Design a binder for this molecule. Structure first.
Ligand SMILES: [Mg+2]
Ligand SMILES: [Mg+2]
Ligand SMILES: [Mg+2]
Ligand SMILES: [Mg+2]
Ligand SMILES: [Mg+2]
Ligand SMILES: [Mg+2]
Ligand SMILES: [Mg+2]
Ligand SMILES: [Mg+2]
Ligand SMILES: [Mg+2]
Ligand SMILES: [Mg+2]
Lengths: 59, 137, 122, 117, 204
RNA sequence: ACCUCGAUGUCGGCUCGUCGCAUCCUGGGGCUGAAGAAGGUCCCAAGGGUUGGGCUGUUCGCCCAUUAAAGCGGCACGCGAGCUGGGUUCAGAACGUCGUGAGACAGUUCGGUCUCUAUCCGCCACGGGCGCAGGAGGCUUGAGGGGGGCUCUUCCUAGUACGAGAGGACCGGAAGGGACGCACCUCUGGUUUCCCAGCUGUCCCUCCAGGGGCAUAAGCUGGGUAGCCAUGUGCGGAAGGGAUAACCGCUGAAAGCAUCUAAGCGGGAAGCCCGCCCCAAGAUGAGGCCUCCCACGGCGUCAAGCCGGUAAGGACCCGGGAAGACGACCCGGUGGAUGGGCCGGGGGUGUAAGCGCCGCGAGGCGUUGAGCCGACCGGUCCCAAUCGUCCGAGGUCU
């Protein structure tokens, strides 16, 4: 039981207006040079590989 | 643009070169101009060089002199337009760069820590004199 | 740089040998005192039967400093101590001799009589 | 504030310098290596320097690679097997590629550091 | 009021008669006339100046139209200067004779979020005696119920730097018509390579 | 004694100021038992400033050394969700005094736990949405606001005015200081966490040599680039313009004289306002300028918009920064030098390892100012910003 303290139960809008700045930016992405896959900028897709740096997975 | 530091050097027309070489760990004297009240003197000031702060043009060196029972130090800039003559007197082995201990421990105990770097002596003694014959012919 | 409660040495035959500053004589609310400046000191140590004995309230001029001295000719100069010469309202020093190097700085301040009897000026 | 010179860091000095020393071993033993982006972005430099000393032919260099690699059989490999493959190359002796995935329970980004070949 | 556009390269020192003058060096030459300001169509007199050429590698902005409307060539950035109506050409530092006083305006070094001491030269508090948690804290901001609030303009913790900081009455040492340079009394703001503008000193 | 018996914690100090003026200093003016300077007295005026210590809990006060002065007062005797427990009127203990007592004292002494989580207002800073009658890039004006304003000493005029000497000026001009404020790294001076070297003990690589770990979260020590700062540097207060306060006049009547006011005019303070510096168009009054972009595919039967691809531009992503808590601001994205690597310059540490010579030796000497290298200044496509995604106008009315 201590120091500063809320005085009045923060209302609903009160609680909610703070939370506008909290919604998530959806992930940005590009399509793979070769794959028909969707993939981040400046990345290596979790299926393909590249053309100067492997990734090549398996069956 | 890509000359950012050449600019300062270009500003360095105030550059001399008749300065002889040396390095921390040896004694030397300068000769300096002081507004001697009514006039100006050549204040010969002989001592040990202690620190050397290099930065191209504004490179400074600090000389220490024990005068009349008082440990003094004196800081001069290399390209100072006040150095008439300046001639070394002796050279010595370094082992370290700066030497802020001759401050505390100033005595005969420095007459054994200095020691005569006789290597550069021959070097100094070489071009000083044997190259005089490479002038008189 | 010399502040109150700072044992200076004594550079003249005035008698004393170690004094502590009280206040700087360079202005109202002023901080330090490099060379060439006058201070009020209290002789805290002095040769027996001198002209200024212990526990006195003197006026002395500072001629040394363990701080550096950015002389306006670029050059700099420093000593291994702090030393003053005891003077008076008449400014002229009260001893009959001064020893130790004294900075050029003083000569400009009209303290001619000291750089006159200087053993070496720097 | 700070950062007017230049560095990347985390955790104390010894840990940091030893970490840079453990990767080189974990690099020169494999090649393709997957760590975190900033741990990698600082690992390129600590490697090439050593690689570049090894391109030199001087046992001086070895003891300066031994200074960070306490295992000869990890460095005699580096010399007479790695360093030649980078002769006639004025630098660049390390590739680093951002990955794409990111581990569970950490959310941290990942990247790959393969010795360029 | 005269004016010229320069950039900071650093500072060293020259020597004068028999003393060392700390200076600072600035590249300010190639500033071309661009757009002026007419007391009839704009409301005042002021001359746009650009500096630091730059090959058009993004400048596809309408700023490309700005330079064709005056035969100018692509500059990095470009600023104005009031009460300065020179000749529709290129203005260099050669209007600055070794003697005039100057007024430099540059950027401030950004010192990030700041402590109230550092920011306003307070004293923080003791190193000892009590609390420990007050070695660099503000220490008291108000009274009590009267007035009850906290004043405006109250020096509190925040942000120091990145502001326009004008300094005044620096004197020119020499000037270089060969490589286009300007030198003054040293203490000029800004990092060694940033925005910095020069103009005559307000006086008589 | 109306307020607080579910805390009004009752004196100062540390920082942080703010206001008041009945003014401490500086400024302006009158009378003076004002020769001169100096002084006293009062009228106007907060602009700025009002030192550091000794003594005890002290604010109060006496003192020290200075000083242009070392002003008084309000803000809960300003300020414990900022600090301070120092005392004060807890529980312990002892001295004095009252009762035979248990205890008591507006007497004394020693010791004696001050609550990490700021909900709302307030404030210092920084952002997202929106708006600014189409959209975007860049450059500016200044309604409005804020900040600083201090002050001594010396000198020429001239030891002239004045006074009998001593003393000793007004107006003007010049130079030097003290503090305070804004910026800076060239020098001075600090740091710089592994940049360089030396040293011990131990444990390792590999026995010698050489090298690594640990002894901090550096093992210790000596030096230190960049960067950040003060003790160091540069600059500032101001000059100048107008209107005023106290005061001083000119013209002149009411009131055939007089009068600064009742019509009217001038001089007049560091004080008022411009000038100086900084923010600033959220200046719903939302500005001004230059430039670049340009219709409707179809629904909404008339409407304000809608479900989609664009322009100029922007963001996203990246590499990054003397920019920065995120965010924001700025440079660069293969036409590029943004980061890392590498080269060289600066610099830092100061003769690397090896070999050889010398010494029974620890060690020294030549290769050697060698070896190593973080930022600084530039260079070089060697590695990495490759590839691309997303947003976004289609111009209301008399
Ligand atoms: Mg003499
Ligand atoms: Mg970094
Ligand atoms: Mg950790
Ligand atoms: Mg450790
Ligand atoms: Mg402190
Ligand atoms: Mg009389
Ligand atoms: Mg006032
Ligand atoms: Mg320094
Ligand atoms: Mg610990
Ligand atoms: Mg000043």
């Amino acid at each position: 039981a201590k120091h500063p303290v809320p005085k009045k139960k923060t209302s609903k809008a009160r609680r909610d207006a703070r939370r506008s700045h909290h919604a998530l930016t959806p992930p940005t992405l590009v399509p793979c040079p070769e794959c028909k896959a969707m993939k981040p900028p400046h990345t290596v897709c979790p299926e393909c590989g590249y053309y100067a740096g492997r990734k090549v997975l398996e069956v | 643009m890509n000359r950012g530091a050449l600019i300062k050097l270009v500003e360095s027309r105030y550059v001399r070169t008749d300065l002889p070489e040396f390095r921390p760990g040896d004694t030397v004297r300068v000769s300096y101009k002081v507004k001697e009240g009514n006039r100006t003197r050549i204040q010969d000031f002989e001592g040990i060089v202690i620190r050397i702060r290099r930065n191209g043009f504004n490179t400074t060196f600090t000389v220490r002199k024990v005068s009349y029972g008082v440990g003094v130090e004196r800081i001069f800039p290399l390209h100072s337009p006040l150095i008439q003559k300046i001639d070394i007197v002796q050279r010595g082995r370094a082992r370290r760069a700066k030497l802020y201990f001759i401050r505390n421990l100033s005595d005969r105990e420095i007459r054994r820590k200095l020691r005569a770097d006789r290597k550069r002596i021959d070097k100094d003694r070489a071009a000083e004199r044997a190259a005089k014959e490479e002038v008189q012919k | 740089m010399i502040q109150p409660q700072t044992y200076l040495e004594v550079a003249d035959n005035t008698g004393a040998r170690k004094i502590m500053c009280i206040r700087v004589l360079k202005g109202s609310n002023a901080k330090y005192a490099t060379v060439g400046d006058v201070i009020v000191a209290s002789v805290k140590e002095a040769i027996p039967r001198g002209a200024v004995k212990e526990g006195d309230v003197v006026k002395a001029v500072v001629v040394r400093t363990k701080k550096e001295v950015k002389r306006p000719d670029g050059s700099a100069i420093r000593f291994d101590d702090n030393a003053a010469v005891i003077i008076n309202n008449q400014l002229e020093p009260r001893g009959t001799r001064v020893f130790g190097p004294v900075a050029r700085e003083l000569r400009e301040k009209g303290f001619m009589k000291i750089v006159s009897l200087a053993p070496e000026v720097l | 504030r700070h950062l007017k010179s230049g560095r990347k860091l985390n955790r104390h000095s010894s840990h940091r310098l030893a970490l840079y020393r453990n990767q080189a071993k974990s690099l020169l033993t494999h090649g393709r290596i997957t760590t975190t982006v900033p741990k990698a972005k600082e690992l390129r430099g600590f490697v090439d320097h050593l690689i570049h000393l090894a391109k030199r032919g001087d046992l001086h260099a070895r003891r300066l690679v031994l200074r960070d690699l306490q295992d000869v059989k990890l460095v005699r490999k580096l010399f007479d097997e790695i360093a030649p493959r980078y002769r006639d190359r004025q630098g660049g002796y390390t590739r680093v590629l951002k990955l794409a995935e990111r581990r569970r329970g950490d959310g941290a980004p990942l990247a790959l550091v393969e010795l360029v070949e | 009021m005269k004016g010229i556009l320069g950039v900071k390269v650093g500072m060293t020192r020259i020597f004068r008669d028999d003393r060392a003058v700390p200076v600072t060096v600035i590249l300010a030459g190639p500033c071309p006339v661009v757009q002026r300001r007419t007391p009839e169509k704009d409301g005042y007199t002021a001359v746009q100046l650009g500096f630091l050429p730059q090959n058009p590698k993004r400048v596809n902005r309408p700023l490309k139209g700005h330079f064709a409307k005056a035969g100018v060539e692509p500059v990095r950035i470009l600023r104005e200067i009031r009460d300065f109506n020179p000749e529709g050409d290129t203005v260099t530092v050669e209007i600055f004779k070794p003697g005039e006083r100057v007024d430099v305006t540059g950027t401030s070094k950004g010192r990030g979020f700041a402590g109230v001491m550092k920011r306003w030269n307070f004293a923080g508090g003791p190193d000892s005696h009590g609390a420990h948690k007050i070695h660099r804290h503000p220490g008291s901001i108000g009274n009590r119920k009267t007035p009850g609030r906290v004043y405006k303009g109250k020096k509190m913790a925040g942000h120091y730097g990145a502001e326009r900081v004008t300094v005044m009455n620096l004197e020119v040492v020499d000037v270089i018509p060969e490589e286009n340079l300007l030198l003054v009394k040293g203490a000029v703001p800004g990092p060694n390579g940033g925005l910095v503008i020069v103009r005559e000193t307000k006086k008589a």
